[PDB]
Design a protein around this nucleic acid. Structure first.
Length: 52
DNA sequence: TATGTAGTCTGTTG
DNA sequence: CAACAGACTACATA
């Protein structure tokens, strides 16, 4: 089941700015990596920020 | 090194 | 065709 970037961020233990999260997606710090569906990313429920 | 704001620009949507 | 989500930025200050 998938979430928008904003909804995903809101449910994280430590929500950040939307810009920050978009940077994490571009740098591939999110596992599993989000799907870009048209103009928006779709995050799996379970996705997490990971260390590089 | 990491993040946040606030600006312009691009591709997708309805 | 206007509004939205994002790609990017300089700059500010953690």
């Amino acid at each position: 089941m998938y979430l928008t970037l904003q909804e995903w961020n809101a449910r994280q233990r430590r929500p950040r700015s939307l810009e920050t999260v978009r940077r994490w997606v571009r740098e591939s710090r999110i596992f599993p990596p989000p799907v870009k569906d048209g103009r928006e990313y779709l995050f799996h429920e379970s996705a997490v920020k990971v260390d590089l």
